[PDB]
Design a protein around this ligand. Sequence first.
Ligand SMILES: [Ca+2]
Ligand SMILES: [Ca+2]
Ligand SMILES: [Ca+2]
Ligand SMILES: [Ca+2]
Ligand SMILES: [Zn+2]
Ligand SMILES: [Zn+2]
Ligand SMILES: [Zn+2]
Ligand SMILES: [Zn+2]
Ligand SMILES: [Zn+2]
Ligand SMILES: [Zn+2]
Ligand SMILES: [Zn+2]
Ligand SMILES: [Zn+2]
Lengths: 274, 274, 274, 274
Amino acid sequence: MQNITQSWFVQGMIKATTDAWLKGWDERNGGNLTLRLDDADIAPYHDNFHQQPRYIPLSQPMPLLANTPFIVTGSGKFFRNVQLDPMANLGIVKVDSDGAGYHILWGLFNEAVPTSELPAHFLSHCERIKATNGKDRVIMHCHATNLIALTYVLENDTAVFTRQLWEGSTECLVVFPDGVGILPWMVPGTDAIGQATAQEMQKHSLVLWPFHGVFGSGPTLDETFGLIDTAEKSAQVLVKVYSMGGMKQTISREELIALGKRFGVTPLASALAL
Amino acid sequence: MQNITQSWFVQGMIKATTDAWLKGWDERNGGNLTLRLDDADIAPYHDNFHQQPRYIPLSQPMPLLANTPFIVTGSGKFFRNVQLDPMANLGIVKVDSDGAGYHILWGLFNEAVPTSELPAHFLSHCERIKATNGKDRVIMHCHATNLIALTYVLENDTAVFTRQLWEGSTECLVVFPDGVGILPWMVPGTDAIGQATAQEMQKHSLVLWPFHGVFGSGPTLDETFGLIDTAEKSAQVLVKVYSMGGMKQTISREELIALGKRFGVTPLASALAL
Amino acid sequence: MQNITQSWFVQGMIKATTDAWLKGWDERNGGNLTLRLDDADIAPYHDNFHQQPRYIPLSQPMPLLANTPFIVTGSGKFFRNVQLDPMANLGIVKVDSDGAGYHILWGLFNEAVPTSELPAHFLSHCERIKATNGKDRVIMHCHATNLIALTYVLENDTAVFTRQLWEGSTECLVVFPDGVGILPWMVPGTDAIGQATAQEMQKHSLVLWPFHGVFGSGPTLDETFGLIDTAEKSAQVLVKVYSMGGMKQTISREELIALGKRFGVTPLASALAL
Amino acid sequence: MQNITQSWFVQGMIKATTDAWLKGWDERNGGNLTLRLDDADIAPYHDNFHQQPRYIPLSQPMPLLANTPFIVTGSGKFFRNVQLDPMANLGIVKVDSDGAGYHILWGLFNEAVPTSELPAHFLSHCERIKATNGKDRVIMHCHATNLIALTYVLENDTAVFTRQLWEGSTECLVVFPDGVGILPWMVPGTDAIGQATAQEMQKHSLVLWPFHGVFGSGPTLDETFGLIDTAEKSAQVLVKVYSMGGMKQTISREELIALGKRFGVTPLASALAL
Ligand SMILES: [Ca+2]
Ligand SMILES: [Ca+2]
Ligand SMILES: [Ca+2]
Ligand SMILES: [Ca+2]
Ligand SMILES: [Zn+2]
Ligand SMILES: [Zn+2]
Ligand SMILES: [Zn+2]
Ligand SMILES: [Zn+2]
Ligand SMILES: [Zn+2]
Ligand SMILES: [Zn+2]
Ligand SMILES: [Zn+2]
Ligand SMILES: [Zn+2]
């Protein structure tokens, strides 16, 4: 075809990672981004693939993802660098017929260790597929600065934290009416945190990791980035308000109820009851 | 002609939306921008228009806008993306001979729903035309971060809020001597908030929506952006000052009076009396 | 020659104004920048000049500036736009043989009112020429955000304010050992504020206008920008420290004395005595 | 060859300095960056070198660096300008056979004074070579804003300061398990501060200079920048948290212990014991 680096999905991965870098959310190798593709996306470019795509087994088979391709940021790669060398910093993988492993079709020098966070991402993709009847395609982790700061000062409780974010920008209830699930602090990279995050993804499109960052899902790169950006903007507003001594006034429960009815969403009951 | 994407007004819309994106004012699809044009602006490009421009009725006819073209950001579009694909994210519309509806001449894939916020914008354009004897041409809504934060901590009163913004940068009284009208919180997208905003636009070039954002008017894209940027800069200064424990000294009433006389403006009486 | 827009000084004016825009210091038409040139800079380009350069008298003759060319930002122009259209937003002027007026050689559509702030700038250039035996060539005014915020919370006194800025970054005493002169608030654009600023320029390379901004001088665009940037960086640090409850420790008088001796500067006595 | 300005190491120096400029860490001539090269890096370009490379003696011979080339930012140069004119703002130097001096092979107009900070950098390179069995190649000094602010409000003690940075982003213990060494304030540019910094570099990859900035080491430009960026991001989070009234909850000692075991690092004992 044209080269795969000019494909919609490589260009989209470059845009999202670069935008997140520019926001200050992705120091060093902090953050990861995975996008579920279709065969029709990657098929024109198959002669650009690795001659012998490396195979990586999954310890935990995921048959819901059989035969499914993804484009991913590599483990240890810097979001800042994706724009400079997408083939070095991104990979295209395809899960096998059994969901027992994946082949690295393109990128990452055909190496296994830059795909280390994929089994955790894959667990969350699976729960988002089920929760959204296949609409969601993206899992994005970043170190969203104000959301992180808030985890040191707000109660790390889904209802309470959700409610404050809803109050901090009018749009938030409409963008994430299901709220933001808040886990306990957990050691990153473990089976435990991957399972716990996927469990929260059953009920929320946003999950926070206290003293660490955020994990979001959505149907497209832009919608997923925009979801995170909306929560982080509210957080930014809140950090300013709290630094000024706290809220003198805010959006009321009654107003939040009226907002949800107008926009035809069901706000998370526990956060709305506060 | 040359292509319409290189026209002064498409390029100007790209600049304004991109600049607002870069300021952090327009997460996701937050914000909207409409610019009133003349027939002479768009006429050279008419063979670039949609073959059969889609017609959208206005529930509320606006004869003051008969035969008037505009360029607009689409409903649901991201300011960040305007620079990447102006034809997808912007539309050119023209109100009909009766003010009873508009045709989508260009952009937006000739679709109706990305023009959903136009009847509210149009109500404010009408009041600004009358208030400025036709000089004002732009309505801009964005989520200006520090202005939003201030609505949680200052009294949401036109006089009081105006006065603080005037104190937070010397230029402000000269740039917006008529002040900043502050509405109650209202559900967005409703006839109620569109009418209420237009009512405030009779008396002010800036209107704030508590816990949401700002709505500004002016004669050009740059002047309208600059108006908002001036208020938001003052707000940024104020958030820092309030975070440091508040004002030790400030611009006095007497100084604000002297400033207005030198620059030949009439400052809003209620804000000046404080 | 090559076109004058590619000249070192037009390119330098673009860089400085653009960098200041990007810092957030120059909303709207806030700020102004003037650079003293030599005839040898502009001579190659004389056939690019206005056919009949417009003449503007100076109410206050300045014979020290006889025959001297400058490149300037226009009155009412936006720093953001200089990069897009330097000829519209910048002018080259040359003071006449008597210092009684200046000709607009290039730019600004050969119009007088975008040169309105020049008589004030010229007064400060004159005092900086005398104070530096002709080394200083630049006067820069901008709305440096943290410096502005500090004028609401620190005593607006040269010694006190200088001392805090020296404490807020180790470099500051070495970069501006003569300190920062602080005026009372004054109505901008007046003969009074222009004279008062020039009077302070006799003793300091930096002057602050409370609740407004900063005015700096130096030998080159980069050194002048860097001077302002150094003070503003210290201010940024200070705003954070004050927002966190104030200094637990700081640079001592004894340390500031040792710093000045090592770097061979004489720190402003009043600020050092505190 | 191709020109040396397109070499990996000139391009890398441009990227790192530009990125640091954009972060706000390197006002004026604040900051310095040195990268240890191999002969094979520079050899293709030798006919681009100065005809007669200037020789600069070292007062303190450093035989560990005999025959070793480096690329460096010049003394007095602005990080902002490196991208505009790398040959003016960068130099390539090579230490002689005895470690008694260095030749300026390229850049800096073959002048001595823009290499003034090299003997201090070289002392730290020597200790990092020994501490890392030759893996570390980069010394970077910058004025990282939030780290600087924190030195006015936290105890300037290695253990205490390290512990807070570890708490302010989960990654930090894994990225700098050896902690951040904190010196007393010292007059910059002196033999004393260069020796003291090198002494701290024996035990830490990061050193802070209170009321001034940070000094980091690592194997590549990206890893060194990323190290600093990680500490500075944590600092940014902390400044927000402290401005909001302090931590309500944080990462516990027990959690930090579990984190270090999972990632196979030995956290600095004193910081972990708190
Ligand atoms: Ca939950
Ligand atoms: Ca009003
Ligand atoms: Ca003085
Ligand atoms: Ca130590
Ligand atoms: Zn992470
Ligand atoms: Zn709960
Ligand atoms: Zn809005
Ligand atoms: Zn009122
Ligand atoms: Zn000004
Ligand atoms: Zn005094
Ligand atoms: Zn330094
Ligand atoms: Zn200790």
